[PDB]
Design a binder for this molecule. Structure first.
Ligand SMILES: CCCCCCCC/C=C\CCCCCCCC(=O)O[C@@H](COC(=O)CCCCCCCCCCCCCCC)COP(=O)([O-])OCC[N+](C)(C)C
Ligand SMILES: CCCCCCCC/C=C\CCCCCCCC(=O)O[C@@H](COC(=O)CCCCCCCCCCCCCCC)COP(=O)([O-])OCC[N+](C)(C)C
Ligand SMILES: CCCCCCCCCCCCCCCCCCCC(=O)O[C@H](COC(=O)CCCCCCCCCCCCCC)COP(=O)(O)OCCN
Ligand SMILES: CCCCCCCCCCCCCCCCCCCC(=O)O[C@H](COC(=O)CCCCCCCCCCCCCC)COP(=O)(O)OCCN
Ligand SMILES: CCCCCCCCCCCCCCCCCCCC(=O)O[C@H](COC(=O)CCCCCCCCCCCCCC)COP(=O)(O)OCCN
Ligand SMILES: CCCCCCCC/C=C\CCCCCCCC(=O)OC[C@H](CO)OC(=O)CCCCCCCCCCCCCCC
Ligand SMILES: CCCCCCCC/C=C\CCCCCCCC(=O)OC[C@H](CO)OC(=O)CCCCCCCCCCCCCCC
Ligand SMILES: CCCCCCCC/C=C\CCCCCCCC(=O)OC[C@H](CO)OC(=O)CCCCCCCCCCCCCCC
Ligand SMILES: CC(C)CCC[C@@H](C)[C@H]1CC[C@H]2[C@@H]3CC=C4C[C@@H](OC(=O)CCC(=O)O)CC[C@]4(C)[C@H]3CC[C@]12C
Ligand SMILES: CC(C)CCC[C@@H](C)[C@H]1CC[C@H]2[C@@H]3CC=C4C[C@@H](OC(=O)CCC(=O)O)CC[C@]4(C)[C@H]3CC[C@]12C
Ligand SMILES: [Ca+2]
Ligand SMILES: [Ca+2]
Ligand SMILES: [Zn+2]
Ligand SMILES: [Zn+2]
Ligand SMILES: [Zn+2]
Lengths: 664, 153, 664, 40, 51
């Protein structure tokens, strides 16, 4: 038998106090008034007594939305501490008004009335409290190192984090941004960015800051949604303190704001500047138009070079035409790259016709990269993540040019390639040019963003490359482990190349041999074993060491089971899970990426593709009027868009019953 | 670590099927076992350049069927010097049945098992990692074991 | 401009009729009574007038749960047709009572009050209507061919199917089975089975019959759940009209009823007859006990053979001990099968020691199979789906024995195997024995049901084999297509075996050749190409027919892309989808299969494993009392377990308001 | 005729098939309370 | 809402006809160039009403 008692005892109520609290709960005004008037004279009932749940008479009256009993208790001067917080959390406007006109707590000490109202996101109570001059303390820098911040963190790191989270919950309230904010959209953008940075910094409190940032982004998107005309939309997007605010939204990674259907419609209308009816056209018509504009890109470039002010000179400045011209230029460059591989004994030969036509494109690519670096800046250049591949391409092309020049000025004779040096400059130049061709042909992935059916796919692939990068670390660890083991076991039986059947040593011979004789060769053997191109007889030695052969073959089999069976299916499961997490947001991400791609063609700089590139207070008032209209519409829409309801209904019915019984 | 349990569950059935087919192929092929001297390079087994005697013994049959999962077992091992075409076809069809059961059925089945088991850990992955990392942190809170090897001796 | 009018016009109401209907809707009793009394004299208002929604005054009064206005309208003799159906569908007991005491329709003509009450599954109204002698028409046979059924189907196949579905919805009601049913559990079982058969037969109306059968199964499971003691449970399971009703539930595939935790507890208590505390034991203790009982299975079998009445004679009759003994016997059989492969030039040799010890096991297996066929019957034998593998094993073993006998009595000399005939009886016997060994070793899959961690897995694999069978048809179609094509292209260049390097022809040689020379060899080449064991040089001919070689290689590549890339990943997706559909029900399916496995060991027949096998009205009254208790408990539990509620609240408030205003 | 029957049946079936409800209930209760207090 | 829709259809009320999906009249292009947000919103509202 387990005895049950009250381990943490409290002060029980008397019979009269319990009767008074029950009368307050039932809403009987007459009995409560009589009890108060009698407590004034006899002092037999404590009006500030709690209940077994901790609520007092005032808290019970607030929870039941009984304004009459609330006012009756307030007129008798009951304890009122923290009652405003309970009235605000209950989201009852009349109670808040009555408390503005005049121990254990469910609210933390740092909670203030305005902060709690912002937490509740109730426009009425927030506006009530903002009518009075109320103020939220300013949060310090995300990485602030002042004496006050470190002192508060060392004294109490739980109180400090809780206070910061409460302040950022108050500031991130959509109703508190609709009011008391000069620019709600820019405030929402900055607040979302700062909350994302705090989520990055605060690891434990990450989900809350993430959801607050997402709430701010959704607030900005809904504010943009309330626009009802193109004039208002272009006033919003072009406000600067064109498309300045849209560029700011792109800077703060506001994907929901950018992917707005109206914003995307405006961007598409700007994108097809020359063609007014591109939206309603057949597939064959669009294909023929694109092919015709692409085949005429040198004519358009030359017309822009000669006279920019003409029917053909400024025709390339249109964003879609500019994109088509750049794509056609890159396609011709890749076609010449394909032609390049179509005497070969010359040591350091002069460049051929195809290479002489390739050189202008390489120079134009390098000049365009350095011009983008000089104009846009450094951070914008490194934020692209495609300028890395462009830098690799340009560096490899420059190395190819340098090695070609060196081999031309250091060699004159025509010696057959069979007796050339392994590190001959021509060979290194050819290898670097082949790698550069691979990279240049792979550079066409960035054009999948301009397509409707190839954009979300590319976004999904970019997002799934992160799971592959995560799996690559563990795969490489296992690979290094097994390579070290097999090398340690097999390096004793290394044989010279002359002893091999065809003077060939390694796994790239017809008969593979010395697969695990060195660390590098062991790494390559275990890499090629993933694809099955490593034969099983490589785990063999000429000596009759059957135990060593079996141990090596079993190491090989263990590596096969770990990589091909465990790691590969594990990576498949990882990618399968990661893809479903992008299925929903694929369209918004693609629209943001395509918006960036479109905005990249809106500038006057870089108009000519290679190789032709080497040859005012009314605004603020209009924006404020539009913002006022948007705020009104958004407040109305959000207003238009449990047991407490039934409890309020029961309280009303009981109060009406008691007053009818008293009247009759 | 949580997906290794599904692999351990699949390993039992895979090993049962492997033992079954190994016993069958051994029972069928152990009559045609040839000495190592008769082999082209005095090498007997599946680790030679020309694989031979792949199903001549239970151990060698197990290893041949293990390596057949990764495709490193050539098809001409299901051959005999005699003109027993029926026996050769029956052995090759046992081999093909084992291939279909393991590579096609069992492997995709294991993939589906791991795919289902991963989604069941997606939600609780953070809490499990935080518990494991808490244990790792508490392991370094003690005075014992302060000096790493070889300074501890 | 699109003009909008009333294409299907109706008869509009007058002002007085609309006012009367509005007074009925608002619940004002006085105005409605005055309107009725005035319509009696002046005949100015039609009391049977509809509304723009088709409802009359009586229907409006029923929908608002206004019993006073309902009775007032009934006393004035308003039209009452089909009002009982609306009162039943509304699930208002008082309205049904008032209508029992006394045009367009929302109910089909075949709907009757008792049928609609059964559809609503309302115990109160169903009992009300069953108090009166009410009757549901009997549905005919699922495959009935009488004149009435075919006549009704040919005259109106929509009315007939609807009537059948309504009748089966009425009969499958849990409340209508709680009442008016001698045995609710057996009725639920039979009804679920018949609804499943109808779902199989009625393809268009499949989901409805499936959900009705599932509802009946859940009703039976919940009736079993209401048991509160082991006595009641064993009374239910052992009722026969032991474990007779449990065997009936197993026969009707009642997986939810079988997998009941209490039923499974009783079955486990019966399963561990000898061990009372097997539930609370360590892993090592259970393992040692199982190993000890398995190593002593011949002693237990011999003790049962000599004296069944002893501490060891009847110790094997315990179900768990019997299962352990049979498993140990099969394990020893497989161990001897493994020993079997451990002079060989004898044509038709006599059996060795291992085969002489194997023969008793084979004879015992055959005798056990034929004894199961003779005892259980034919349908039960073919329902197992494992007796197919047992039949294959026994047929192959019998063929092995026959071929061994023939080779022994037809050959005496010792000729080396190299010069033996291709179809020598010894070779066929050895091949059949190897196939039999494969099948016998694969027979251990059926023992995974007895394990907790291996049972649901085996169920999932059995359920995923159906998707593989579905994919096999399309794979074989594509395989046959490409095999026919490659054969048609390549059969001209077939070369003799002597012309081959080692007198070897086919793909099983060291150098593969003639891979697509015949239909059979083409099928095998394309089969082995799935696993990559078919080399690429087989798509080559000695002649310089480069076009033919390229066309054949491209057929091969197309087949590779279709099978390995498309079909294989498609099958992976199929199995991945099919597995999640079994994840939820895996435990119940495993528990049903394990219950069947346990019940298989409850019989006296087949006690000895191979090779030792070849050497009363109180019951119904108790069951009825238990069933009455269960029905009461289930009705109470189901009773314990939208805009119409708010509409009823508003109607009550408005009626009270009007009556208060009239009184004052 | 068949289409008219179908339209009637569909309208009836669709008719047969939040805070504003509670607000309407509270409004009705408050109005009844005020009118009772005024009458008494 | 069937009741209110029928109420308003009792009076002769009329919804403007949407033009062709690929219409190229002067009115459509003028409305699209003047305000492409108001035009799309009006078309969507008309097609929500008709559907
Ligand atoms: C993004 C990351 C950067 C990518 C771009 C890097 C651009 C850098 C370009 C610098 C190229 C310099 C070539 C070496 C010339 C000097 C020389 O003699 O070679 C010596 C060594 O030879 C080598 O080590 C060859 C190195 C080739 C690097 C290939 C990078 C592939 C990137 C793939 C990316 C996927 C020969 O020795 P010896 O003296 O003759 O004796
Ligand atoms: C479940 C489905 C049934 C499965 C069990 C079947 C049992 C049936 C058993 C009957 C076995 C009869 C053997 C033939 C003897 C006659 C003979 O001379 O062979 C002749 C032909 O030879 C053949 O066709 C061999 C056929 C082997 C069948 C193997 C079945 C494998 C089932 C795998 C299942 C997975 C030789 O020709 P000749 O006259 O010498 O010239
Ligand atoms: C001896 C060795 C010889 C080797 C010769 C062959 C070498 C082959 C190398 C192959 C490398 C291929 C890399 C291709 C990556 C494609 C990624 C596609 C998806 C994608 O769009 O990724 C974008 C980044 O681009 C990128 O990921 C660009 C990657 C550049 C890699 C440079 C090094 C290679 C992400 O988009 P985003 O980051 O812009 O979006 C910002 C939103 N906020
Ligand atoms: C002739 C043969 C020659 C063969 C030569 C090569 C042999 C290679 C053998 C490879 C075996 C690799 C085993 C690695 C297992 C890695 C598991 C990673 C996931 C993981 O963290 O598992 C933890 C256990 O660690 C572990 O699973 C440790 C496993 C130790 C295995 C020892 C035998 C090998 C679970 O974490 P936790 O259990 O601590 O969490 C308790 C929470 N309540
Ligand atoms: C020249 C050719 C030489 C070939 C030599 C090698 C031949 C190898 C043949 C391999 C065939 C393997 C078949 C194994 C099937 C395993 C199925 C495991 C899952 C499972 O429990 O299936 C149960 C049926 O058993 C079954 O599926 C038994 C299948 C019997 C197949 C017989 C033919 C082979 C279903 O359980 P259940 O149906 O009892 O559940 C009734 C609930 N209502
Ligand atoms: C991921 C990070 C670590 C993962 C940890 C563990 C993964 C599981 C461990 C894998 C052990 C593989 C053993 C390989 C082996 O013993 O045989 C090679 C050698 C090759 O000669 O073969 C044998 O020694 C006997 C082969 C019998 C069958 C082995 C069955 C092991 C697993 C089979 C299939 C899985 C597909
Ligand atoms: C898991 C536990 C048991 C699973 C049970 C059953 C799995 C399915 C049974 C598999 C039968 C495979 C048959 C292989 C065979 O007959 O040919 C080998 C032999 C090799 O010589 O080829 C043939 O005899 C003719 C080949 C024709 C095509 C066979 C198609 C069978 C399945 C094909 C593809 C599946 C991918
Ligand atoms: C399933 C039922 C039908 C499915 C229907 C269609 C499936 C897709 C059609 C597959 C066409 C495969 C073409 C193979 C081929 O042309 O080359 C073979 C031959 C082999 O000599 O190679 C070529 O002719 C040129 C190869 C260039 C690359 C071909 C790319 C095709 C698909 C590639 C990868 C897919 C992984
Ligand atoms: C696929 C194999 C045969 C290699 C072919 C290389 C190129 C000829 C392909 C590869 C990627 C293709 C590009 C993928 C994406 C687009 C976007 C597309 O733009 C649109 O979708 C129209 C809508 C718009 O951009 O306004 C223009 C064609 C283009 C450049 C494609 C042109 C043809 C490209 C360059
Ligand atoms: C896995 C490789 C090495 C082949 C081994 C073959 C056998 C030695 C294995 C294969 C399947 C195993 C069986 C799988 C299932 C079970 C159920 C198990 O029963 C239980 O789970 C205890 C609970 C109960 O049955 O009451 C008894 C062991 C047994 C027969 C196992 C015994 C060992 C078996 C026969
Ligand atoms: Ca760039
Ligand atoms: Ca059987
Ligand atoms: Zn600070
Ligand atoms: Zn009939
Ligand atoms: Zn128009």
């Amino acid at each position: 038998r387990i005895p049950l008692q009250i381990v943490r005892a409290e002060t029980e109520l008397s019979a009269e106090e319990k009767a008074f609290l029950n009368a307050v709960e039932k809403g009987d005004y007459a009995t409560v008034k009589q009890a108060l008037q009698e407590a004034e004279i006899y002092y037999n009932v404590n009006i500030n007594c709690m209940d077994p749940l901790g609520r007092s008479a005032l808290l019970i009256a607030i929870e039941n939305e009984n304004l009459e009993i609330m006012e009756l208790l307030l007129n008798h001067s009951v304890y009122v501490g923290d009652a405003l917080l309970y009235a605000i959390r209950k989201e009852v406007v009349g109670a808040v008004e009555l408390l503005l006109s005049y121990q254990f707590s469910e609210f933390t000490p740092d909670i203030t009335p305005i902060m709690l109202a912002a937490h509740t996101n109730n426009y009425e109570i927030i506006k009530l409290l903002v009518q009075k001059r109320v103020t939220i303390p300013r949060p310090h820098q995300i990485r602030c190192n002042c004496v006050e911040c470190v002192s508060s963190s060392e004294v109490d790191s739980l109180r400090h984090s809780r206070s910061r989270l409460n302040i950022y919950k108050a500031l991130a309230s959509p109703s508190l941004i609709a009011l008391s904010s000069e620019d709600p959209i820019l405030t929402a953008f900055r607040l979302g960015w700062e909350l994302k940075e705090l989520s990055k910094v605060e690891n434990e409190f990450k989900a809350e800051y993430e959801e607050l940032s997402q709430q701010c982004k959704l607030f900005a998107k809904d504010l943009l949604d309330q626009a009802r005309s193109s004039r208002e939309l272009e006033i919003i997007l072009n406000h600067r303190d064109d498309l300045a605010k849209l560029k700011v939204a792109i800077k703060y990674h506001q994907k929901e704001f950018v992917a707005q259907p109206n914003c995307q419609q405006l961007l598409a209308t700007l994108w097809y500047d020359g063609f007014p009816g591109w939206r309603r056209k057949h597939w064959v018509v669009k294909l023929l138009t694109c092919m015709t504009i692409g085949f005429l890109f040198p004519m358009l470039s030359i017309a822009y070079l000669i006279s920019p002010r003409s029917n053909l000179g400024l025709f390339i400045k249109k964003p879609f035409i500019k994109f088509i011209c750049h794509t056609a230029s890159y396609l011709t460059f890749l076609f010449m790259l394909l032609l390049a591989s179509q005497d070969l004994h010359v040591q350091g030969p002069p460049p051929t016709v195809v290479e002489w036509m390739i050189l202008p494109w390489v120079l134009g690519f390098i000049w365009g990269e350095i011009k983008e670096m000089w104009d846009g800046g450094f951070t914008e250049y490194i934020h692209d993540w495609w300028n890395l591949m462009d830098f690799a391409m340009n560096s490899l092309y420059l190395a190819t040019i340098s090695l070609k020049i060196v081999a031309y000025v250091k060699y004159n004779g025509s010696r057959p390639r069979e007796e050339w040096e392994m590190w001959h400059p021509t060979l290194i130049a050819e290898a670097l040019f082949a790698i550069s061709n691979i990279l240049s042909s792979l550079r066409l992935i960035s054009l999948f963003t301009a397509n409707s059916h190839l954009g979300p796919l590319q976004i999904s692939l970019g997002r799934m490359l992160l799971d592959i990068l995560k799996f690559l670390f563990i795969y490489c660890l296992v690979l290094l482990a097994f390579a070290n083991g097999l090398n340690q076991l097999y390096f004793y039986y290394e044989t010279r190349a002359i002893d091999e059947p065809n003077n060939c040593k390694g796994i790239r011979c017809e008969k593979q041999n010395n697969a695990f004789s060195t660390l590098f060769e062991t790494l390559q053997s275990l890499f090629w074993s993933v694809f099955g191109l490593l034969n099983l007889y490589v785990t063999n030695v000429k000596a009759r060491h059957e135990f060593t052969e079996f141990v090596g073959a079993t190491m090989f089999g263990t590596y096969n089971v770990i990589s091909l069976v465990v790691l590969l299916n594990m990576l498949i499961a990882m990618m399968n899970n990661s893809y479903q997490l992008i299925a929903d947001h694929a369209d918004i991400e693609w629209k943001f990426a395509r918006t960036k791609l479109w905005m990249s063609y809106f500038d006057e700089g870089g108009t000519l593709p290679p190789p032709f590139n080497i040859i005012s207070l009314i605004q603020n008032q209009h924006y404020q009027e539009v913002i006022r209209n948007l705020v009104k519409r958004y407040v109305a829409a959000m207003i238009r868009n449990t047991e407490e309801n039934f409890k309020e209904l029961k309280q009303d019915i009981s109060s009406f019953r008691y007053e009818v019984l008293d009247l009759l």
